[PDB]
Design a protein that fits this description.
heterodimer; A: 87 residues; Alpha-Beta Plaits; two-stranded antiparallel ribbon; 2 helices; B: 166 residues; alpha/beta; Rossmann fold; four-stranded parallel sheet; 4 helices; 20% strand; binds the ligand O=C(O)C[C@@H](CO)NC(=O)[C@@H]1CC[C@@H]2CCCC[C@H](NC(=O)c3nccc4ccccc34)C(=O)N21; hydrolase; caspase-1; nanomolar inhibitor; dimeric
Chain lengths: 87, 166
């Protein structure tokens, strides 16, 4: 028998910061989910999930009318998670 | 929703990033990837999430364009969510899989995700810790040493998250 870490190789990504609200469009859809789709399509080939989710936060950096900041929590990733689309 | 057409990676680029600090990837001829989607649109107490079906069309297609097999479960309680999370991990398809993705699209507070039977008097809150406990190496042995990504689309409170400046 051999021991192993109970929690490892996890990553959570939320739509807003704690004690704040996320913005959802009634006909177009959630601003966060839409932007995650725009970034994942373009950067899955050259960037990893940590590199991608960092770029996602940057597009929210300018607050006008409605403001929301995505956050990355409880990260136990020891390696780079590259998707490699097409393979 | 969105078309989901992802910009592909070339073999010229794939061989260029070769390392012991990259997660291993299985062969496409035998690998069985799994992605789970849970969305609450219709509610008894709090208002209906109009335009939620657009965000289901986007993610369900994008994850499928990344080789994953998508499962969509609509309008569930906190106790129903807990059973579906245990059923997803108990699937032996994870054994011949390199990664997994999970998306939660409902309402929320500081404590967690709200079910379809949630109210201010009698709540139905699902903590983020309960999700991490069910997906760990103790409860889920099939996903050992593998990436496990979790996406959350819900509120975290009531404040607008903004502060004025000069
Ligand atoms: O459903 C979720 O997960 C998000 C939810 C968390 O409780 N957030 C919400 O209910 C937030 C907080 C209050 C308000 C409630 C009424 C429902 C629709 C509204 N939508 C927009 O005001 C809106 N959002 C984005 C872009 C817009 C562009 C033009 C006009 C209006 C726009 C919206 O999302 N919320």
């Amino acid at each position: 028998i051999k021991k192993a870490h109970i929690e490892k190789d996890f990553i959570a990504f939320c739509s807003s910061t704690p004690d704040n609200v996320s913005w959802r469009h009634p006909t177009m859809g959630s601003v966060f989910i839409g932007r995650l789709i725009e970034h994942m399509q373009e950067y899955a080939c050259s960037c990893d999930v940590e590199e991608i989710f960092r770029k996602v936060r940057f597009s929210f950096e300018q607050p006008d009318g409605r403001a929301q900041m995505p956050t990355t929590e409880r990260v136990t990733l020891t390696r780079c998670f590259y998707l490699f689309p097409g393979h | 929703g969105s078309e989901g057409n992802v910009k592909l990676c070339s073999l010229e680029e794939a061989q260029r990033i070769w390392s012991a600090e990259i997660y291993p990837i299985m062969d496409k001829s035998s690998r069985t990837r799994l992605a789970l989607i849970i969305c609450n649109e219709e509610f008894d107490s709090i208002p209906r999430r109009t335009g939620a079906e657009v965000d289901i069309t986007g993610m369900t297609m994008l994850l499928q364009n990344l080789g994953y097999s998508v499962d969509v479960k609509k309008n569930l309680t906190a106790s129903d969510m807990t059973t579906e999370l245990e059923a997803f991990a108990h699937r032996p398809e994870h054994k011949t899989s390199d990664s997994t993705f999970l998306v939660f699209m409902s309402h929320g507070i500081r404590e967690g995700i709200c079910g379809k039977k949630h109210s201010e008097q009698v709540p139905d809150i699902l903590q983020l810790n309960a999700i991490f406990n069910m997906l760990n190496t103790k409860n889920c042995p099939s996903l050992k040493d593998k990436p496990k990504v979790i996406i959350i689309q819900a509120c975290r409170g009531d404040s607008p998250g903004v502060v004025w400046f000069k």
